[PDB]
Amino acid sequence: SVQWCAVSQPEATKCFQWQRNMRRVRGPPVSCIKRDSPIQCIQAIAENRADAVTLDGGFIYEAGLAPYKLRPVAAEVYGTERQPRTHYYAVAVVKKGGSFQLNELQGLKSCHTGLRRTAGWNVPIGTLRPFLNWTGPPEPIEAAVARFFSASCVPGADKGQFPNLCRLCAGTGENKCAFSSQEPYFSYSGAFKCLRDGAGDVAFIEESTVFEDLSDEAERDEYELLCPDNTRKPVDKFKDCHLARVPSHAVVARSVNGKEDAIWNLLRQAQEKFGKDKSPKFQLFGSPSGQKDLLFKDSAIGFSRVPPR
Ligand SMILES: [Fe+3]
């Protein structure tokens, strides 16, 4: 069977429920393996301890490098069944009423989904590069960001080398600034909560986050986006106001003996049986109260296969 790699107990738990349900409906079998970080899972898959894992774009390049050499086999699909899309938007969310624009963020507080992730780090820092006063290697980019923002929460950052990059995180004790759900400000929802609670002045997340977390349209009106043309616009205008349009998270696997065809068969059948509003028993794209993005993004509605190689 296809062995899936989880990066936490909540994921492992969902993975076992997935296995039990696939069995129940006589569908393709799936097995589970528990690890602790995206990288550990990359390793497991490289040495045949696992077969697949879903990763944010920022980790795709890494996993594709040696020795690992893993490649994407299926991409998450977002939007609606009506208008499917294999991309999402990296946006900058701020509270309505401020006057500062994208070029005036020096000294403020920031909330990021996590270190090395696309919408939360790679795109934002790449955009702010000209304001960072970064000399370049051998200086870590984190040092330049640490002295740009007053304080922030960047899960995964080295609390010892860059103390203020972890200062705004709300994790408890040793789980503070952790690159996992043990840190409340981790991932899209986590970063957005970091803004809502008032810890930060800007959240670097995706366009659908504000609509998922805040159902009441009245509440969404107290948030704005920072557009790269140094203007501010409503949250529903992300298409004319984003930092970048980025490729969706993807399921990766070994380019050699990757069981790519099995993995695709598992996903196509899982999507059809347990996709959006498909089953009251199990949701492939959902999580129990208090959890977010377990295995796959909660905003995903299906999968799209990547071209043969
Ligand atoms: Fe992402």
CSV table of C-alpha atoms and ligand atoms in Angstrom, one decimal:
chain,number,residue,atom,x,y,z
A,1,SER,CA,0.0,0.0,0.0
A,2,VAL,CA,0.9,3.7,-0.2
A,3,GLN,CA,2.6,4.9,3.1
A,4,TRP,CA,1.6,8.5,3.9
A,5,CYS,CA,3.9,10.6,6.1
A,6,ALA,CA,2.4,12.6,9.0
A,7,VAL,CA,4.2,15.5,10.8
A,8,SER,CA,2.3,15.4,14.1
A,9,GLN,CA,-0.1,13.4,16.2
A,10,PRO,CA,-3.1,15.2,14.9
A,11,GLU,CA,-2.1,14.4,11.4
A,12,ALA,CA,-1.3,10.8,12.3
A,13,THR,CA,-4.7,10.6,13.9
A,14,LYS,CA,-6.4,11.8,10.8
A,15,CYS,CA,-4.2,9.5,8.7
A,16,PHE,CA,-5.5,6.4,10.7
A,17,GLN,CA,-9.1,7.5,10.2
A,18,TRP,CA,-8.4,7.8,6.5
A,19,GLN,CA,-7.0,4.3,6.5
A,20,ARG,CA,-10.1,2.9,8.4
A,21,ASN,CA,-12.5,4.7,6.0
A,22,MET,CA,-10.7,3.6,2.8
A,23,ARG,CA,-11.0,0.0,4.1
A,24,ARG,CA,-14.7,0.5,5.0
A,25,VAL,CA,-15.5,1.6,1.4
A,26,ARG,CA,-13.3,-1.0,-0.3
A,27,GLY,CA,-11.1,1.6,-1.8
A,28,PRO,CA,-7.3,1.8,-2.4
A,29,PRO,CA,-5.3,1.1,0.8
A,30,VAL,CA,-3.3,3.7,2.6
A,31,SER,CA,-0.8,3.2,5.5
A,32,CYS,CA,0.5,5.8,8.0
A,33,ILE,CA,3.9,6.8,9.3
A,34,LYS,CA,4.5,9.5,12.0
A,35,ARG,CA,7.4,11.9,11.8
A,36,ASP,CA,8.0,15.4,13.4
A,37,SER,CA,9.0,17.8,10.6
A,38,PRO,CA,8.5,18.2,6.8
A,39,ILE,CA,12.2,17.5,6.4
A,40,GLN,CA,12.1,14.3,8.4
A,41,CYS,CA,9.3,13.1,6.2
A,42,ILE,CA,11.4,14.0,3.1
A,43,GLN,CA,14.1,11.7,4.4
A,44,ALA,CA,11.7,8.9,5.2
A,45,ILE,CA,10.4,8.9,1.6
A,46,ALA,CA,14.0,9.0,0.2
A,47,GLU,CA,14.9,5.8,2.1
A,48,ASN,CA,11.7,3.9,1.3
A,49,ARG,CA,10.2,4.3,4.8
A,50,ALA,CA,7.3,6.2,3.3
A,51,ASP,CA,5.9,7.0,-0.2
A,52,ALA,CA,4.2,10.5,-0.1
A,53,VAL,CA,3.7,13.8,1.7
A,54,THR,CA,2.1,17.1,0.9
A,55,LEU,CA,4.4,20.2,1.0
A,56,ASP,CA,4.2,23.9,0.7
A,57,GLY,CA,6.0,25.2,-2.3
A,58,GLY,CA,8.9,26.5,-0.3
A,59,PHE,CA,9.9,22.9,0.5
A,60,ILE,CA,9.5,21.6,-3.1
A,61,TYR,CA,12.9,22.9,-4.2
A,62,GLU,CA,14.6,21.4,-1.2
A,63,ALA,CA,13.0,17.9,-1.6
A,64,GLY,CA,14.0,18.0,-5.2
A,65,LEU,CA,17.6,18.4,-4.4
A,66,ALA,CA,20.1,15.6,-3.6
A,67,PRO,CA,20.3,13.3,-1.9
A,68,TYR,CA,16.5,13.1,-1.5
A,69,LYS,CA,15.6,13.9,-5.2
A,70,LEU,CA,11.8,13.7,-4.6
A,71,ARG,CA,9.4,15.1,-7.3
A,72,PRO,CA,5.8,16.4,-7.2
A,73,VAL,CA,3.1,13.9,-8.4
A,74,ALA,CA,-0.1,15.7,-7.6
A,75,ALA,CA,-1.0,19.3,-6.9
A,76,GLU,CA,-3.8,20.5,-4.6
A,77,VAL,CA,-6.7,22.3,-6.3
A,78,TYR,CA,-8.4,25.3,-4.8
A,79,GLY,CA,-11.3,27.7,-5.6
A,80,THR,CA,-14.6,26.0,-6.4
A,81,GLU,CA,-15.7,23.1,-8.6
A,82,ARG,CA,-16.9,25.9,-10.9
A,83,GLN,CA,-13.6,27.7,-11.1
A,84,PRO,CA,-10.7,25.3,-10.1
A,85,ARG,CA,-7.2,26.7,-9.8
A,86,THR,CA,-3.8,25.2,-9.0
A,87,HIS,CA,-2.6,28.4,-7.4
A,88,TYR,CA,-3.3,30.7,-4.5
A,89,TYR,CA,-2.4,34.3,-3.6
A,90,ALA,CA,0.2,35.5,-1.1
A,91,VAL,CA,-1.3,38.6,0.5
A,92,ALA,CA,-0.5,41.0,3.3
A,93,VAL,CA,-3.3,41.5,5.8
A,94,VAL,CA,-3.5,44.5,8.1
A,95,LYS,CA,-6.2,46.2,10.4
A,96,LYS,CA,-8.3,48.8,8.7
A,97,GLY,CA,-7.5,52.3,9.7
A,98,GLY,CA,-3.7,52.3,9.7
A,99,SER,CA,-2.0,54.5,7.2
A,100,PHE,CA,1.2,52.6,6.6
A,101,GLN,CA,1.8,51.0,3.2
A,102,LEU,CA,4.0,48.1,2.0
A,103,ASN,CA,7.0,50.3,1.8
A,104,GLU,CA,6.7,51.6,5.3
A,105,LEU,CA,7.0,48.4,7.4
A,106,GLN,CA,10.3,49.1,9.1
A,107,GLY,CA,10.1,48.8,12.8
A,108,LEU,CA,6.6,47.2,12.9
A,109,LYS,CA,5.6,43.8,14.1
A,110,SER,CA,5.0,40.8,11.8
A,111,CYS,CA,3.2,37.5,11.7
A,112,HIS,CA,4.4,34.7,9.4
A,113,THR,CA,3.1,31.3,8.6
A,114,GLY,CA,6.5,29.9,9.1
A,115,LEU,CA,10.2,29.9,8.1
A,116,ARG,CA,10.9,29.1,4.4
A,117,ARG,CA,7.2,28.8,3.5
A,118,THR,CA,5.9,30.5,0.3
A,119,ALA,CA,3.2,33.1,1.3
A,120,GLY,CA,4.5,33.5,4.8
A,121,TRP,CA,8.2,33.9,4.1
A,122,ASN,CA,9.8,33.5,0.7
A,123,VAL,CA,7.5,35.9,-1.1
A,124,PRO,CA,7.3,38.6,1.6
A,125,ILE,CA,11.0,38.8,2.3
A,126,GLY,CA,11.7,38.6,-1.4
A,127,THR,CA,9.4,41.5,-1.9
A,128,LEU,CA,10.9,43.5,1.0
A,129,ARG,CA,14.5,42.8,-0.1
A,130,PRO,CA,15.2,46.4,-1.3
A,131,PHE,CA,14.3,47.7,2.2
A,132,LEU,CA,16.2,45.0,4.2
A,133,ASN,CA,19.7,46.4,3.8
A,134,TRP,CA,21.0,42.9,3.5
A,135,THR,CA,24.6,42.5,2.5
A,136,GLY,CA,24.2,38.9,1.5
A,137,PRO,CA,26.0,35.6,2.3
A,138,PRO,CA,27.5,34.6,4.7
A,139,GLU,CA,25.0,36.6,6.6
A,140,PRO,CA,21.7,34.6,7.2
A,141,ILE,CA,18.7,36.4,5.8
A,142,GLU,CA,17.1,36.1,9.2
A,143,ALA,CA,19.6,38.5,10.7
A,144,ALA,CA,18.6,41.1,8.2
A,145,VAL,CA,14.9,40.5,8.9
A,146,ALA,CA,15.5,40.5,12.6
A,147,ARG,CA,16.8,44.1,12.5
A,148,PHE,CA,14.1,45.2,10.1
A,149,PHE,CA,10.9,44.2,12.0
A,150,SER,CA,10.7,45.3,15.7
A,151,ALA,CA,9.4,41.9,16.6
A,152,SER,CA,7.6,39.0,15.0
A,153,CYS,CA,6.5,35.4,15.0
A,154,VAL,CA,8.3,33.1,12.5
A,155,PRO,CA,7.7,29.5,13.5
A,156,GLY,CA,10.8,27.4,12.9
A,157,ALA,CA,13.3,30.3,13.3
A,158,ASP,CA,16.2,29.7,15.7
A,159,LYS,CA,15.0,31.4,18.9
A,160,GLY,CA,18.7,31.5,20.1
A,161,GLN,CA,20.2,33.3,17.1
A,162,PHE,CA,17.3,35.5,16.2
A,163,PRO,CA,15.3,36.0,19.5
A,164,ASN,CA,12.9,38.7,18.2
A,165,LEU,CA,11.8,36.5,15.2
A,166,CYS,CA,10.1,34.4,17.9
A,167,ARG,CA,9.1,37.1,20.3
A,168,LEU,CA,5.5,37.4,19.2
A,169,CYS,CA,4.7,33.7,19.1
A,170,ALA,CA,2.3,32.3,21.6
A,171,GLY,CA,3.6,28.8,22.1
A,172,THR,CA,3.9,27.4,25.6
A,173,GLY,CA,7.4,27.0,27.0
A,174,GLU,CA,9.6,24.9,24.7
A,175,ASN,CA,6.8,24.8,22.0
A,176,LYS,CA,7.1,28.6,21.5
A,177,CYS,CA,8.1,29.3,17.9
A,178,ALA,CA,7.7,25.6,17.0
A,179,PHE,CA,7.2,24.7,13.4
A,180,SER,CA,3.9,22.9,14.1
A,181,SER,CA,0.4,23.2,15.4
A,182,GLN,CA,1.7,23.2,19.0
A,183,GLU,CA,2.4,26.8,18.2
A,184,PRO,CA,-1.0,28.7,18.0
A,185,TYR,CA,0.4,31.2,15.5
A,186,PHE,CA,1.6,28.5,13.1
A,187,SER,CA,0.4,28.4,9.4
A,188,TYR,CA,-2.1,30.5,7.6
A,189,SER,CA,-4.7,30.6,10.4
A,190,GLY,CA,-2.1,30.9,13.1
A,191,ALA,CA,-0.5,34.0,11.4
A,192,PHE,CA,-3.9,35.6,11.0
A,193,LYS,CA,-4.8,35.0,14.6
A,194,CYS,CA,-1.5,36.7,15.5
A,195,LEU,CA,-2.9,39.8,13.8
A,196,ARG,CA,-6.4,39.5,15.1
A,197,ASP,CA,-5.2,39.3,18.7
A,198,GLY,CA,-3.1,42.4,18.1
A,199,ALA,CA,0.3,41.0,18.6
A,200,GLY,CA,1.3,41.9,15.1
A,201,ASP,CA,0.6,44.7,12.6
A,202,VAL,CA,0.8,42.6,9.4
A,203,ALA,CA,0.0,39.0,8.5
A,204,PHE,CA,1.6,37.3,5.5
A,205,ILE,CA,-0.9,34.6,4.5
A,206,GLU,CA,-3.2,33.5,1.6
A,207,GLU,CA,-6.3,35.1,0.2
A,208,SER,CA,-8.9,32.6,1.5
A,209,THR,CA,-7.8,32.7,5.2
A,210,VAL,CA,-9.8,35.8,6.2
A,211,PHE,CA,-13.0,34.3,4.6
A,212,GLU,CA,-12.6,30.9,6.4
A,213,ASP,CA,-11.8,32.3,9.9
A,214,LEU,CA,-14.3,35.1,9.8
A,215,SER,CA,-17.8,34.2,8.6
A,216,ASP,CA,-19.4,37.5,9.6
A,217,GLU,CA,-19.0,39.9,6.7
A,218,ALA,CA,-19.1,42.7,9.3
A,219,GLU,CA,-15.8,41.5,10.8
A,220,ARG,CA,-14.0,41.2,7.4
A,221,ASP,CA,-14.6,44.9,6.9
A,222,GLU,CA,-12.1,45.8,9.6
A,223,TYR,CA,-9.2,44.2,7.7
A,224,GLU,CA,-7.4,45.4,4.6
A,225,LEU,CA,-4.7,44.2,2.2
A,226,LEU,CA,-1.4,46.0,1.5
A,227,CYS,CA,-0.9,46.1,-2.4
A,228,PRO,CA,2.5,46.4,-3.9
A,229,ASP,CA,1.6,49.7,-5.6
A,230,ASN,CA,1.6,51.2,-2.0
A,231,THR,CA,-2.1,51.5,-1.7
A,232,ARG,CA,-4.6,49.6,0.5
A,233,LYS,CA,-7.7,47.8,-0.7
A,234,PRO,CA,-10.6,45.6,0.7
A,235,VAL,CA,-9.9,41.9,1.3
A,236,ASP,CA,-12.1,40.7,-1.5
A,237,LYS,CA,-9.8,42.4,-4.0
A,238,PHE,CA,-6.9,40.0,-3.6
A,239,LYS,CA,-6.8,39.5,-7.4
A,240,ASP,CA,-5.8,43.1,-8.0
A,241,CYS,CA,-3.8,43.3,-4.8
A,242,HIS,CA,-1.4,40.5,-4.0
A,243,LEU,CA,2.3,40.1,-3.5
A,244,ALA,CA,2.4,37.0,-5.8
A,245,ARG,CA,0.3,34.3,-7.4
A,246,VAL,CA,1.9,31.0,-6.3
A,247,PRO,CA,1.7,27.3,-7.2
A,248,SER,CA,-0.3,25.1,-4.9
A,249,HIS,CA,1.1,22.7,-2.3
A,250,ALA,CA,2.0,19.4,-3.9
A,251,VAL,CA,2.2,15.7,-3.0
A,252,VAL,CA,5.8,14.7,-3.6
A,253,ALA,CA,7.4,11.2,-4.1
A,254,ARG,CA,10.6,9.4,-5.2
A,255,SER,CA,11.3,10.1,-8.9
A,256,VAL,CA,12.5,6.4,-8.9
A,257,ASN,CA,10.2,3.7,-7.6
A,258,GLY,CA,7.8,6.4,-6.3
A,259,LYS,CA,4.6,4.3,-6.8
A,260,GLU,CA,3.3,7.5,-8.5
A,261,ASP,CA,0.4,5.7,-10.2
A,262,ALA,CA,-0.7,4.1,-6.9
A,263,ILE,CA,-0.6,7.4,-5.1
A,264,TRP,CA,-2.6,9.1,-7.8
A,265,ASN,CA,-5.2,6.3,-7.7
A,266,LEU,CA,-5.4,6.6,-3.9
A,267,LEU,CA,-6.0,10.4,-4.1
A,268,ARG,CA,-8.5,10.3,-7.0
A,269,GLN,CA,-10.6,7.8,-5.1
A,270,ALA,CA,-10.2,9.5,-1.8
A,271,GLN,CA,-11.3,12.8,-3.3
A,272,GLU,CA,-14.3,11.2,-4.9
A,273,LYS,CA,-15.4,9.4,-1.8
A,274,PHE,CA,-14.4,11.8,1.0
A,275,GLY,CA,-14.1,15.1,-0.8
A,276,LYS,CA,-16.0,18.3,-0.1
A,277,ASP,CA,-19.5,17.5,1.2
A,278,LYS,CA,-19.1,13.9,0.0
A,279,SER,CA,-19.3,12.0,3.3
A,280,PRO,CA,-20.7,12.6,6.8
A,281,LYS,CA,-18.3,10.0,8.1
A,282,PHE,CA,-15.0,11.4,7.0
A,283,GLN,CA,-13.6,14.6,5.4
A,284,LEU,CA,-10.3,14.4,3.5
A,285,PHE,CA,-10.2,18.2,3.4
A,286,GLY,CA,-11.3,19.0,6.9
A,287,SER,CA,-10.2,18.9,10.6
A,288,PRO,CA,-11.8,18.6,14.0
A,289,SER,CA,-12.5,21.8,15.9
A,290,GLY,CA,-9.3,23.5,16.8
A,291,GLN,CA,-7.2,22.0,14.0
A,292,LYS,CA,-6.1,23.3,10.6
A,293,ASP,CA,-4.6,21.9,7.4
A,294,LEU,CA,-4.0,18.3,8.6
A,295,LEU,CA,-2.3,16.4,5.7
A,296,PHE,CA,-3.9,18.7,3.1
A,297,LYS,CA,-5.0,22.3,3.1
A,298,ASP,CA,-8.5,22.8,4.4
A,299,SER,CA,-9.1,25.1,1.4
A,300,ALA,CA,-8.4,22.3,-1.1
A,301,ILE,CA,-11.2,20.7,-3.1
A,302,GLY,CA,-9.3,18.1,-5.0
A,303,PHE,CA,-6.1,17.1,-6.8
A,304,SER,CA,-4.5,17.6,-10.2
A,305,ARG,CA,-1.8,15.3,-11.6
A,306,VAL,CA,1.5,16.8,-12.6
A,307,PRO,CA,2.9,15.9,-16.1
A,308,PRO,CA,4.9,12.7,-16.6
A,309,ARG,CA,8.7,12.7,-16.3
B,1,FE,FE,1.7,27.6,1.3
